Each structure stands twice: as structure tokens, then as C-alpha cells.
Design an enzyme around this catalytic site. Structure first.
Site, short mmCIF file in Angstrom:
data_model
loop_
_atom_site.label_atom_id
_atom_site.label_comp_id
_atom_site.label_asym_id
_atom_site.label_seq_id
_atom_site.Cartn_x
_atom_site.Cartn_y
_atom_site.Cartn_z
N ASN A 13 16.63 12.26 12.36
CA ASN A 13 15.74 13.11 12.26
C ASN A 13 15.40 13.39 10.62
O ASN A 13 16.41 13.77 9.92
CB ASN A 13 16.06 14.63 12.90
CG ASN A 13 15.35 15.76 12.63
OD1 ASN A 13 14.45 16.02 11.55
ND2 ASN A 13 15.15 16.55 13.52
N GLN A 38 -0.64 5.77 11.14
CA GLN A 38 -0.51 6.22 9.99
C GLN A 38 1.08 7.11 9.76
O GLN A 38 1.54 7.71 10.67
CB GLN A 38 -1.39 7.62 9.70
CG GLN A 38 -2.83 7.24 9.74
CD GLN A 38 -3.48 6.29 9.05
OE1 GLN A 38 -2.97 6.35 7.66
NE2 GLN A 38 -3.91 5.24 9.52
N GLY A 39 1.68 6.60 8.61
CA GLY A 39 3.17 7.41 8.52
C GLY A 39 3.97 5.89 8.90
O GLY A 39 5.38 6.15 8.56
N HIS A 65 0.62 -1.27 -0.05
CA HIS A 65 -0.05 -0.12 -0.02
C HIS A 65 0.92 1.23 0.16
O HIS A 65 0.45 2.37 -0.18
CB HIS A 65 -1.21 -0.04 1.30
CG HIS A 65 -0.49 0.42 2.57
ND1 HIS A 65 -0.19 -0.64 3.54
CD2 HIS A 65 -0.30 1.60 3.03
CE1 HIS A 65 0.15 0.12 4.40
NE2 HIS A 65 0.34 1.45 4.34
N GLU A 76 18.76 7.50 8.40
CA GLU A 76 18.09 8.78 8.88
C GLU A 76 17.84 8.58 10.55
O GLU A 76 17.59 7.45 10.93
CB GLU A 76 16.83 8.83 8.28
CG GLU A 76 16.91 9.25 6.77
CD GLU A 76 16.78 10.80 6.73
OE1 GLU A 76 16.70 11.47 5.80
OE2 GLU A 76 17.34 11.62 8.04
N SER A 84 3.56 3.00 8.04
CA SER A 84 3.33 2.10 7.04
C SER A 84 4.38 1.55 6.28
O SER A 84 5.20 2.42 6.12
CB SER A 84 2.18 2.76 6.01
OG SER A 84 0.90 2.86 6.51
N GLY A 85 4.48 0.43 6.11
CA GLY A 85 5.71 -0.15 5.60
C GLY A 85 6.64 -0.68 6.18
O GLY A 85 7.84 -1.17 5.86
N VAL A 132 16.16 16.81 9.09
CA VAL A 132 17.47 17.74 9.45
C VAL A 132 18.56 16.53 8.74
O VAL A 132 18.61 15.48 9.07
CB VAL A 132 17.80 17.84 10.69
CG1 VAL A 132 19.14 18.70 10.63
CG2 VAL A 132 16.79 18.81 11.45
N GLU A 162 23.26 10.21 6.51
CA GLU A 162 22.25 9.76 5.38
C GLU A 162 22.81 9.23 4.17
O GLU A 162 23.81 9.53 3.64
CB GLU A 162 21.47 11.06 4.86
CG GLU A 162 20.27 11.49 6.19
CD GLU A 162 21.17 12.49 7.05
OE1 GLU A 162 22.40 12.72 6.97
OE2 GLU A 162 20.53 13.40 7.95
N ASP A 185 0.19 -7.65 1.73
CA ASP A 185 0.76 -6.08 1.67
C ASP A 185 2.22 -6.02 1.86
O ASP A 185 2.75 -5.87 2.94
CB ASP A 185 -0.10 -5.51 2.86
CG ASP A 185 0.24 -3.97 2.95
OD1 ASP A 185 0.68 -3.54 1.67
OD2 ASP A 185 -0.09 -3.23 3.62
N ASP A 208 0.92 1.39 19.88
CA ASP A 208 0.74 1.01 18.64
C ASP A 208 1.59 1.62 17.69
O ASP A 208 1.98 2.86 17.83
CB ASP A 208 -0.78 0.95 18.51
CG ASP A 208 -1.33 0.31 17.41
OD1 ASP A 208 -2.69 0.55 16.97
OD2 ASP A 208 -0.50 -0.43 16.78
N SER A 209 1.57 1.23 16.49
CA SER A 209 1.90 1.89 15.27
C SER A 209 0.83 2.68 14.63
O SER A 209 -0.27 2.51 15.11
CB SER A 209 2.72 1.01 14.12
OG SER A 209 1.59 0.13 13.56
N1 LIG Z 1 -3.22 1.10 14.52
C1 LIG Z 1 -2.37 0.75 13.59
N2 LIG Z 1 -1.41 -0.17 14.01
C2 LIG Z 1 -2.12 1.31 12.30
C3 LIG Z 1 -1.01 1.35 11.62
C4 LIG Z 1 -0.78 1.82 10.16
C5 LIG Z 1 -1.96 2.17 9.31
C6 LIG Z 1 -1.89 2.70 7.90
N3 LIG Z 1 -2.49 1.80 7.14
C7 LIG Z 1 -3.54 2.11 6.52
O1 LIG Z 1 -4.32 3.32 6.91
C8 LIG Z 1 -3.93 1.02 5.55
C9 LIG Z 1 -3.50 1.39 4.28
C10 LIG Z 1 -4.52 1.99 3.24
C11 LIG Z 1 -5.95 1.65 3.91
N4 LIG Z 1 -5.54 1.34 5.23
C12 LIG Z 1 -6.55 1.09 6.32
O2 LIG Z 1 -6.12 0.86 7.20
C13 LIG Z 1 -7.98 0.70 6.15
O3 LIG Z 1 -8.47 -0.02 5.27
C14 LIG Z 1 -8.82 -1.50 5.48
C15 LIG Z 1 -8.02 -2.07 6.26
C16 LIG Z 1 -7.88 -3.55 5.96
C17 LIG Z 1 -8.29 -3.73 4.55
C18 LIG Z 1 -8.59 -2.31 4.15
C19 LIG Z 1 -3.24 2.22 10.20
C20 LIG Z 1 -3.33 1.54 11.34
CA LIG Z 2 18.16 13.08 8.56
#
Ligand SMILES: N=C(N)c1ccc(CNC(=O)[C@@H]2CCCN2C(=O)COC2CCCC2)cc1
Ligand SMILES: [Ca+2]
Length: 223
Positions: free
Chosen positions: A54, A174-175, A40, A52, A177-178, A57, A62, A84, A171-172
Site C-alpha cells: 500500500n 496512467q500511473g 518519460h 511497497e 508508467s515506467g 500506508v 519499505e 523510452d 491493460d496497464s
Molecule cells: N493503455 C496503456 N497500456 C497505457 C499505459 C500507460 C500510459 C502512460 N503513458 C503516456 O501517457 C505516454 C507518456 C507521455 C505521453 N504518453 C502518451 O501515451 C501519448 O503520447 C504519444 C504516445 C506515443 C508517442 C507520444 C498510457 C497508456
Molecule cells: Ca507502504
């Protein structure tokens, strides 16, 4: 990362930032030429940022390297986020050193209750928005699949696992991700999804990397 701590500079040397004019996702270096991230996080025009701490900065350790190619898992389903995972190749080989280092792929899956390290530059707030500039860390155990499936009925596949705390607070987000989930020195997970962040009975959901080792090894050897 919500409820975590400042890692400290380059203490997570396999952690990368994916940049497309801005940080948009984490990743994990798995050798001098390849990164593992979430499907995603796919886009083109990716620059891989290694060494990395900061991310706003330039502190001097880097390496910024453009991606030459990306490969999304052939079975990635964007509706459900099943499979994913994505591989990113660097246009030029990274220079490995103490602050830029690869993380090993698992030789087997990990067990429930195992403690892992999750890291990233994502939002640090449960309700609201605050982005850190330095890398944040969290220690979190793998949760039982039953607890995982109970939280997210009908949404968990054999390619996913939950980690965190059902009580919430840590928890983890948004941002992140990956980014990596590292357990016993192996990359066992990728930050994938969850409901909200750090919510009670809504643990984070991670890509189960031990299911993809063959696909990763075969793909990088052919690309
Ligand atoms: N609470 C957490 N650990 C957490 C961590 C990272 C993220 C970022 N991920 C996201 O926002 C992901 C990517 C696009 C859709 N999305 C979603 O979370 C929502 O979409 C549905 C989830 C399962 C099937 C689709 C979301 C949640
Ligand atoms: Ca840096």
C-alpha cells in the site's frame, strides 16, 4: 492496471514506486544501486520507494532512498517515445531481502505469445479514474508485431512491443508508467504508452528492454 488483480504484498519484490511528494511512476530494481524506468518518467527530486504494497500506508517493509542521479537514454525521443528508458541510481545501496529484490535483465528477447506479468499502482478504470493504493498485477501475452503495428500505424519502432489483449478489458494505464513487464523471470518491458487504457484493438505499448542490455550494463558500470 485495468482488469487485473491485487498482487498481494511484496509478491513483486523488484517493483518500485517513484515518488516526488506523491507516486508518479513505477520502476524495476535491477541491482542494489540501480533502477530501470521510462524516460518519460524523468524529473529531478526523485525518491525511490522499495518494499511497497500500500503506497499510502507504512506497513514496515519499505525502504525510501533518494536518487543520486538519473540517466535518460541518449536517443530518447519524447515526441514518439522511441527509446523510452531511463536509469536511476540510489544515493545509498538498497538492503536486499525477500521483499526487496532485483529482477534479471534478459539474455535474449522474448517471443510473441509469451506470457508476462505487468504491475503497478496506476488507474484501474477503463473509462474514468480510480487509483488503487495496493499493487495491482496483470498476466498478459506478448502480441505479434503485426498486430502491434496494425493498431498503431507508423508509430511502432524496433524498440517497442505490444502486450495485452486486442479484445480490451485488460491493460496497464496512467500511473503504471515506467513499471515492469516480466516474462520468464526477465525484465523484458517497461510500461510506456497506448491509446486510452484497455480499449479494443489498442493494446499497451512497452519499451523493448532486450535492446538496451548493453547500454544498461555499460552505463551502470561507468556511473
Ligand atoms: N493503455 C496503456 N497500456 C497505457 C499505459 C500507460 C500510459 C502512460 N503513458 C503516456 O501517457 C505516454 C507518456 C507521455 C505521453 N504518453 C502518451 O501515451 C501519448 O503520447 C504519444 C504516445 C506515443 C508517442 C507520444 C498510457 C497508456
Ligand atoms: Ca507502504
Amino acid at each position: 492496471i485495468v482488469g487485473g488483480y491485487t498482487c498481494g504484498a511484496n509478491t513483486v519484490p523488484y517493483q518500485v514506486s517513484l515518488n516526488s511528494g506523491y507516486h508518479f511512476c513505477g520502476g524495476s530494481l535491477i541491482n542494489s544501486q540501480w533502477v530501470v524506468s521510462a524516460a518519460h518518467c524523468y524529473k529531478s527530486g526523485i525518491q525511490v520507494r522499495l518494499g511497497e504494497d500500500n503506497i499510502n500506508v507504512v506497513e514496515g517493509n519499505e525502504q525510501f532512498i533518494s536518487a543520486s542521479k538519473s540517466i535518460v537514454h541518449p536517443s530518447y525521443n519524447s515526441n514518439t517515445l522511441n527509446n523510452d528508458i531511463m536509469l536511476i541510481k540510489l544515493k545509498s545501496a538498497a538492503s536486499l531481502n525477500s521483499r526487496v529484490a532485483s529482477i534479471s535483465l534478459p539474455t535474449s528477447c522474448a517471443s510473441a505469445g509469451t506470457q508476462c506479468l505487468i504491475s503497478g499502482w496506476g488507474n484501474t478504470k477503463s473509462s474514468g479514474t480510480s487509483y488503487p493504493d495496493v499493487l495491482k498485477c496483470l498476466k498478459a501475452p506478448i502480441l505479434s508485431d503485426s498486430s502491434c503495428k496494425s493498431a498503431y500505424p507508423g508509430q511502432i519502432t524496433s524498440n517497442m512491443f505490444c502486450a495485452g489483449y486486442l479484445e480490451g478489458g485488460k491493460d496497464s494505464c496512467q500511473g503504471d508508467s515506467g513499471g515492469p513487464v516480466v516474462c520468464s523471470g526477465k525484465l523484458q518491458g517497461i510500461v510506456s504508452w497506448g491509446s486510452g487504457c484497455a480499449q479494443k484493438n489498442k493494446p499497451g505499448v512497452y519499451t523493448k528492454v532486450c535492446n538496451y542490455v548493453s547500454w544498461i550494463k555499460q552505463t551502470i558500470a561507468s556511473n
